[model samples]
Target: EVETFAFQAEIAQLMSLIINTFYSNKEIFLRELISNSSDALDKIRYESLTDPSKLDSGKELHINLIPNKQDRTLTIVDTGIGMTKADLINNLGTIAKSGTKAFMEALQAGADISMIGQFGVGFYSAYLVAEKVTVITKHNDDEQYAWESSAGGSFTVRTDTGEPMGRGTKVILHLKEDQTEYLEERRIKEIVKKHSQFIGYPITLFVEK
Candidate 1:
């Protein structure tokens, strides 16, 4: 199917607002990403029952956090249904989801304006901590690809040469100096427990020895 068009102007503004102000607690970024990862795992698991090939990658479903203090980098990797190049851009680049428009229309119709998780803009939350972000993904039906971006205007997507993940995604955060708090094992673990303890997949933390 042809992917959706670029986001409408209002949708762009909504995305900017979400990246700048929605979650008061910055740590919730970890929660949101992990929650997304868990959802992907759930999706693949359900599909696996009917399509045995979906489980060929292996039965383990989990999230992994690898922190590199020296380089000020943190990576969150998951063994879940990953995205295709089109999926990467449509899902991450623009705001085209139905929920966002519905939420806005509700507000215009004089309904409650509570800020809810209405947009896939949740991925943009990485900008809250990283000066640069890289996504390495392998879709079940497509070749692996890497998407890199700064929170600035443009991003680059290219074929990834890394070992194929089989069927999953990995997000690497190149932390800003002020965002170093995320590199601490204790802090990341605490945030995970507070927000993602109930996530359907196991979450693992890898600290430098």
Candidate 2:
């Protein structure tokens, strides 16, 4: 079953603002996304301390980067605490609605409010390099769902009946023409080395030959 939802007005505007405002810092998009993945893994780790069942038996924590040049897409997969439908809508759809406006204001005001370490905001940075983004996630207590958007008007979330994956999140970025550099394994590795070196979990970049 598939269902679509219009982005909140504030989020739509914020996405446009982010795309135009951070055009030059496009590489940081990977950093932001990787950081978000790392945080999700951290969440699962923390939760598992109390409830060991949060983890699926021996599933390991890691991040995988798959860059498909043929499709001009980059997918980041993370073994982490996945989101439920409500979590997807709440986290990806309506992110701190009023706060988004505040971020937009800070952008226009030319203030130095940083988005680093901020939840949800950095996810919008995907718009800097991608025309479309898709997220597939499975939670311990909920069925898998796919959330997708083109950063133009609305997004869609639906029950995903595809191949089963471990509880985690997978993000696919359909890159813009000028941003295909992200599909290069060497380039992505460099970015990971530079920005995500400190993350404790393993990060593997799959090279398509």
Candidate 3:
């Protein structure tokens, strides 16, 4: 069943600080996303080594970046360990391992925003440059689904009728006003070189001429 859950507590406030104070260098959003994809890929690979069947029979290992400049959208997709509906709730709403209380304490104490990795709020960085963010994922156990949020306290998840994506996740960041730099091919290529060149899988970018 599809469900929309509100952030447990204070999450909206934390993400607000993330958008306004932390990651003002909005490019960090892409970097963090790529990093997350890498981690997911690594996870599936490690497990695949022990049991190749874990890849849902034969999941390809690839990461694709598509910049739809016409639509002003940036999509980063990875054939990795995708999340289930429950996983999405736990990962997206809980504020990461430190939990809601710890994050709140960090916020109250004026912790460094760059320490975003500490709270595992790296995904929130997307809000820095995106006015809207949608995550589409397919897992071996769960039906394909999409999560939509604008960093509000709540997020909605709905079943996606799109063709099954095998096993992977796609993050679509719709650029915010004045954030057109992210929609440029040159800009994306440069960032991929500087931040994701060493990634184990080829990170492909789609920029049609």
Candidate 4:
């Protein structure tokens, strides 16, 4: 099922408030994406122990980075527990709720970074770098899908019938003009190594020789 819905102005402002809160606040951008990838991989690994078929047996469970200078895009990909259509809707809603009003209230009072993944707060950091972000994922239980957003009140999801990703996620971040530093292989390597090694998985960055 392919559907596109536009978010109202008020909700868009709320999401902007939450993401802006983090950028105004440091380095949580790449950290969040890597952290989420780690969690996805971890989930599949644990599930595979109980059901060997949850993830492809031979697929390498690692993260990959692809940079495109021509398009000013940086893509982060991971072979992990990709989401179903319902999962996308639910997860997206969870992110919205956790980042605004009630969740923000808890954080303001005294919530910590440990609470991030619980509410999908990390997902918003992508908007700090990319005005437009796209996620293409393939789940064994559901057809591959593409979900894109501009950090506004709404997003669109459509069926992706291209080559299947087996089971994983690909996040393409259309970098902002002044934020091209992230397009550099050197910087991305350093940030991932320094702040994201705790993820317990290999992250490979592609660079031009």
Candidate 5:
């Protein structure tokens, strides 16, 4: 089934602000991504309780970070409830979640004097450092698919041609030269522990020798 949706124009501007200017601390990008990974694993684990067959499918709940300095790429892969095409559009394209709109409105309303993480717009956080982002995912309910974007106002979706991920999601961030700090193993680990140490699933980092 095909579906369509649109984001408020200001959202695009807001995304640019958050990604380009507001988030000055580059380290938080890894934290945000890892936290997202934890969330994904949590969703699948909850789903598996009612359906034991999910566990039998080899969908191990874990987060992996693969860094390739040669290609200037950093990939964050997770074995979780992979998203479908509709999910890609809705989750990444628009602010359909209640908390996200509330957060945006709050920002515009200038009501926040302290802490705020209510926005569900975590996916776009990848663009803070990535020049291009690719998402390869496989859903238990349907065929695997790939989504690509440059965070330049558009994205493309296509069928997965390579070997499927069994069941999960892999996000590849084409890192910009200025964002090389994310390539350091020690730096990544520190960020993970700071933001995701209490995460329910195991998180691993893959570093090249």
Candidate 6:
């Protein structure tokens, strides 16, 4: 069943604020995404310590940034702890409601929080540059699923029938015309150097020729 969900009121507010008013540096959106991927990579590596089967997908842990100029899409792929359907809903649909309470209060206090500690809120920033976002993920215990949205009132989640993803998440951003800068290899590398050099996992940027 393909289920549809509406963004919670607080989530909608957060998304609108980020997409319209929050970040003057739009490139930070890419930074947040890569940071998230690194977190996923870290999770799987840690989990495998307790349950070695967690590495069944493969021991390789890395992130890939691929830009398709012809399709006008920027794709981020990570061999990390992929999300199940429930994870997709909770992580993407709700905007970390557990933390949103304090986070919203800090809006005026001008609290600066990273997506890692706060969790999932920074993903809304994708709307700053993308017309639509699609996430396809697979967890060790669950089948693959796809989550898609247009930064609108609602989003949809359904089972993914394409070639099964080994394990990890692939996020595809359908970029707005003015946001094409993200599709450039030089620009992505610069952003990575500035914001994500400290990320432990290897992140590679591949250009589509």
- Top candidate on lDDT is 6
- Tell me model 5's lDDT, rounded to 2 decimals: 0.73
Worst 10 residues of 4 by lDDT: 18-27
After superposition of all CA atoms, the RMSD between model 4 and the true structure is 3.0
Q: Candidates' TM-scores?
A: 0.82, 0.91, 0.88, 0.85, 0.85, 0.91
Cα lDDT of candidate 3 equals 0.79
Q: State each candidate's clash count.
A: 0, 0, 0, 2, 0, 0
> Cα lDDT of all candidates, in order?
0.74, 0.82, 0.79, 0.75, 0.73, 0.82
Q: Could you tell which candidate, 4 or 5, scores higher by TM-score?
A: 5
Candidate ranking (TM-score, best to worst): 2, 6, 3, 5, 4, 1
For candidate 3, write residues 77-178 as lDDT tens digits: 999888888878776523464544465577679865545655666787788888889999877778788998887678889898876788888999988878
TM-score of 3: 0.88
How close to the true structure is residue 109 of candidate 3, measured as C-alpha lDDT? 96
Query: Candidate 2 residues 1-209, lDDT tens each?
Result: 67888887877887777666644656878888888888889989999999888886336999999999999999999988888899898855335576686676666676532462353577877888899999999888789899999877688999898878779889999999999999987889899998889988899999897
Model 6 scores a TM of 0.91
Cα displacement (Å) at residue 161, model 6: 1.3
**What is the C-alpha lDDT profile of model 1 across 69-123, one tens digit per residue?**
9888989899888888988777553454665676667656764323234444456
User: Which residue pairs show collisions in model 6?
Assistant: none
Better model by TM-score, 4 or 6?
6
RMSD (Å) of each candidate, 1 decimal: 4.3, 2.1, 2.5, 3.0, 3.4, 2.2
TM-score attained by model 4: 0.85
lDDT tens readout by residue for model 5, 135-186 = 8887777678888876555667778888768888899999987998898999
